[PDB]
Write an enzyme that holds these catalytic residues in place. Sequence first.
Site, PDB file in Angstrom:
ATOM      1  N   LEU A  14       0.729  -1.138   0.087  1.00 34.17           N
ATOM      2  CA  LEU A  14       0.034   0.089  -0.066  1.00 34.17           C
ATOM      3  C   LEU A  14       0.875   1.309   0.066  1.00 34.17           C
ATOM      4  O   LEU A  14       0.742   2.212  -0.666  1.00 34.17           O
ATOM      5  CB  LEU A  14      -0.896   0.123   1.070  1.00 34.17           C
ATOM      6  CG  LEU A  14      -1.881  -0.995   1.191  1.00 34.17           C
ATOM      7  CD1 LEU A  14      -2.641  -1.187   2.370  1.00 34.17           C
ATOM      8  CD2 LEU A  14      -3.090  -0.729  -0.035  1.00 34.17           C
ATOM      9  N   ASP A 129       3.745  15.632  11.443  1.00 30.30           N
ATOM     10  CA  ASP A 129       3.901  15.154  10.091  1.00 30.30           C
ATOM     11  C   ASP A 129       2.694  15.429   9.300  1.00 30.30           C
ATOM     12  O   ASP A 129       2.572  14.328   8.435  1.00 30.30           O
ATOM     13  CB  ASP A 129       4.745  14.096   9.912  1.00 30.30           C
ATOM     14  CG  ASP A 129       5.414  13.679   8.705  1.00 30.30           C
ATOM     15  OD1 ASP A 129       5.659  12.403   8.339  1.00 30.30           O
ATOM     16  OD2 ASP A 129       5.686  14.691   7.839  1.00 30.30           O
TER      17      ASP A 129
HETATM   18  N1  LIG Z   1      -3.871   2.069   7.038  1.00 27.74           N
HETATM   19  C1  LIG Z   1      -3.991   2.088   5.606  1.00 27.74           C
HETATM   20  O1  LIG Z   1      -4.746   1.675   4.839  1.00 27.74           O
HETATM   21  C2  LIG Z   1      -2.609   2.583   5.062  1.00 27.74           C
HETATM   22  C3  LIG Z   1      -1.628   3.053   5.687  1.00 27.74           C
HETATM   23  C4  LIG Z   1      -0.669   3.667   5.265  1.00 27.74           C
HETATM   24  C5  LIG Z   1      -0.633   3.744   3.737  1.00 27.74           C
HETATM   25  N2  LIG Z   1       0.578   4.441   3.135  1.00 27.74           N
HETATM   26  C6  LIG Z   1       1.560   5.266   3.800  1.00 27.74           C
HETATM   27  C7  LIG Z   1       2.812   5.329   2.831  1.00 27.74           C
HETATM   28  C8  LIG Z   1       3.895   6.540   3.522  1.00 27.74           C
HETATM   29  C9  LIG Z   1       3.047   7.821   3.924  1.00 27.74           C
HETATM   30  N3  LIG Z   1       1.813   7.532   4.619  1.00 27.74           N
HETATM   31  C10 LIG Z   1       0.820   6.485   4.038  1.00 27.74           C
HETATM   32  C11 LIG Z   1      -1.613   3.409   2.957  1.00 27.74           C
HETATM   33  C12 LIG Z   1      -2.059   3.477   1.586  1.00 27.74           C
HETATM   34  C13 LIG Z   1      -3.250   2.901   1.572  1.00 27.74           C
HETATM   35  C14 LIG Z   1      -4.187   2.834   0.356  1.00 27.74           C
HETATM   36  C15 LIG Z   1      -5.393   2.470   0.334  1.00 27.74           C
HETATM   37  C16 LIG Z   1      -6.195   2.155  -0.743  1.00 27.74           C
HETATM   38  C17 LIG Z   1      -5.871   2.477  -2.153  1.00 27.74           C
HETATM   39  C18 LIG Z   1      -4.655   3.092  -2.117  1.00 27.74           C
HETATM   40  C19 LIG Z   1      -3.518   3.295  -1.112  1.00 27.74           C
HETATM   41  N4  LIG Z   1      -3.742   2.462   2.579  1.00 27.74           N
HETATM   42  C20 LIG Z   1      -2.617   2.916   3.659  1.00 27.74           C
END
Ligand SMILES: NC(=O)c1ccc(N[C@H]2CCCNC2)c2cc(-c3ccccc3)[nH]c12
Length: 269
Positions: A14, A129
Amino acid sequence: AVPFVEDWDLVQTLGEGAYGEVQLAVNRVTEEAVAVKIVDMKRAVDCPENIKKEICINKMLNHENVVKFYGHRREGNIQYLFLEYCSGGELFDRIEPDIGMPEPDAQRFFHQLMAGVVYLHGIGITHRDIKPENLLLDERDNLKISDFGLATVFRYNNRERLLNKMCGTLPYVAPELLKRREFHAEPVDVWSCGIVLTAMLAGELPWDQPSDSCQEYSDWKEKKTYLNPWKKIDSAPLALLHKILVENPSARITIPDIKKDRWYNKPLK
Ligand SMILES: NC(=O)c1ccc(N[C@H]2CCCNC2)c2cc(-c3ccccc3)[nH]c12
């Protein structure tokens, strides 16, 4: 990890960070989806205490605009954090480059961002952040504050302490982080919310950093709002941005006063 992966499919990544990566885990039988943050503690000597802090802070959180924390477990030198899967993805991908998004959508997300930030501040937690990459969306486009790896406690019971860590993503950091040895936590998060609001309305970050050596920051201090990104922003949300993006943190608008702002309260289409 071994019995968990026998029943749960780690479908895809993700996101990625310095800590490691976040995977989408789907239970083969129930089809329940959970986000699994995987952290290799070997990437830093301070990491066990650092992730212990993120875990500790995550255990304190319970709010509709904050990513839910389910639990965690250590497997050798690897830490696993189990989090609410936010199927709407990052707020970042709702922002069209150089355009932003419709003003009512930016307003609704900003109200939800304020609800989440008020909640964290009320329990004495500062995020440090806030940026569109750390604001996720659920299946009903409700904003959820995410990524508490830099979060810290600024108030113990009813006693504030000043912070001194040069934290976060530089285009989002408040100018006092480059000017003062110690500073109040809450105006820093308020400033980054103003940068998020600028990005949602114009699809562009206004400066590399809020230094007097940065021309784009000098242009803003000089009220040159006929320049990008400001010229794309209507006068009502810009008047709120003029109150948030105030250099002196003691003169900066507080969230109780953001809640009195005309654009904040404006009924839009
Ligand atoms: N808890 C979650 O669902 C989650 C946690 C961290 C996620 N990236 C980080 C990457 C570094 C910066 N901060 C966010 C994502 C990215 C997604 C996602 C969902 C659906 C579609 C496309 C991406 N979900 C998440």
